[PDB]
Amino acid sequence: ELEFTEGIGFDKGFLSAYFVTDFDNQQAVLEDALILLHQDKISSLPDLLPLLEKVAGTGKPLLIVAEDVEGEALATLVVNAIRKTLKAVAVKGPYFGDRRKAFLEDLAVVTGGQVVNPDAGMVLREVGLEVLGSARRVVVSKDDTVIVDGGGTAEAVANRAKHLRAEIDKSDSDWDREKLGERLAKLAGGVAVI
């Protein structure tokens, strides 16, 4: 079809009500935000602090999409979001297994960021603003997240789309093909135009 819903979204909402910016619509709204995509779970504050201090210094709000966010890391995130010293929201990644990791890569592609993957050998404590994606607008609801106009490049998006189409033609499972198809549809609507 030619119709599509603006931005890229998934059925995962905020991890804490303390991140809510508008209780009328029960959602957290971020404008011109920075986006951290983390493969694993974020819990250690020391490991996350260095990047958070950098982000806090930028004045832009932050969306965090990880396997899960908890412990002392979630706490300082909540606290600083309340004080507004760092307007942020933490959300959990949508799917599971390879599909889960593949979707974070999709998000990184459309937002122009880089997935932080400790399993690959990366270390959060040493990453800078370069690993962060960007989006003109982010809206996190109780059970869903939508990202509008990501900062990804034309070639990264085009290549990812070509990659998904190839996966669709080499798939011998209708169930699988359909999942790939929905990722392709979402991908397209997440990037910024003009």
Coordinates of N, CA, C and O in Angstrom, one line a residue, residues 4 13 18 28-29 31-32 55 57 76-77 95 102 106 113 116 118 121 130 146 148-149 169 172 194:
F4 N 0.8 5.2 5.0 CA 1.7 4.8 6.0 C 1.5 5.7 7.2 O 1.0 6.9 7.1
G13 N 6.1 1.0 25.9 CA 5.9 2.3 26.5 C 7.0 2.6 27.5 O 8.0 1.9 27.7
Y18 N 7.3 8.3 36.1 CA 8.1 9.6 36.5 C 8.6 10.3 35.2 O 8.9 11.4 35.3
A28 N 5.1 10.9 27.4 CA 6.4 11.7 27.5 C 6.7 12.1 26.1 O 6.8 11.4 25.2
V29 N 6.8 13.5 25.9 CA 7.1 14.0 24.6 C 8.4 14.7 24.6 O 8.7 15.6 25.4
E31 N 11.4 16.8 22.1 CA 11.6 17.5 20.9 C 13.1 17.6 20.6 O 13.9 17.9 21.5
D32 N 13.5 17.3 19.4 CA 14.9 17.3 19.0 C 15.7 16.6 20.0 O 16.6 17.1 20.7
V55 N 25.5 14.1 27.7 CA 24.2 14.4 27.2 C 23.6 15.6 27.9 O 23.1 16.5 27.3
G57 N 25.0 17.9 29.2 CA 25.7 19.1 28.8 C 25.2 19.7 27.5 O 25.4 20.9 27.2
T76 N 18.7 7.4 38.9 CA 19.2 8.7 38.6 C 18.6 9.3 37.4 O 18.4 10.5 37.3
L77 N 18.1 8.4 36.5 CA 17.4 8.8 35.3 C 16.1 9.5 35.7 O 15.7 10.6 35.3
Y95 N 10.9 -6.5 20.2 CA 10.8 -8.0 20.1 C 11.7 -8.8 20.9 O 11.9 -8.5 22.1
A102 N 17.9 -7.0 15.7 CA 17.8 -6.5 14.4 C 16.9 -5.2 14.4 O 17.2 -4.3 13.5
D106 N 17.7 -1.4 13.2 CA 16.8 -0.6 12.3 C 16.7 0.8 12.9 O 16.8 1.8 12.1
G113 N 22.2 6.6 14.5 CA 23.0 6.3 15.7 C 23.7 5.0 15.5 O 23.8 4.5 14.4
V116 N 24.9 0.2 20.9 CA 25.9 -0.1 21.9 C 25.8 -1.5 22.3 O 24.8 -1.9 22.9
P118 N 27.6 -4.5 24.2 CA 28.7 -5.0 25.1 C 29.1 -6.4 24.7 O 30.3 -6.8 24.8
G121 N 31.7 -6.4 22.3 CA 33.0 -5.8 22.9 C 33.0 -4.4 23.2 O 34.0 -3.9 23.7
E130 N 28.8 10.4 19.7 CA 28.8 9.8 18.4 C 27.9 8.6 18.2 O 27.3 8.4 17.1
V146 N 6.7 6.1 19.5 CA 6.8 6.6 18.2 C 7.9 7.6 18.1 O 8.1 8.4 18.9
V148 N 9.7 10.2 15.4 CA 9.5 11.0 14.1 C 10.7 11.8 13.6 O 11.4 12.5 14.3
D149 N 10.9 11.6 12.3 CA 12.0 12.2 11.6 C 13.4 12.0 12.2 O 14.0 12.9 12.8
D169 N 12.7 -12.2 0.0 CA 12.7 -13.1 -1.1 C 13.4 -14.5 -0.8 O 13.1 -15.5 -1.5
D172 N 11.5 -18.8 3.4 CA 10.5 -19.8 3.0 C 9.5 -20.1 4.0 O 8.9 -21.1 4.1
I194 N 13.4 16.2 3.7 CA 13.6 17.7 3.5 C 14.0 18.4 4.8 O 15.1 19.0 4.8

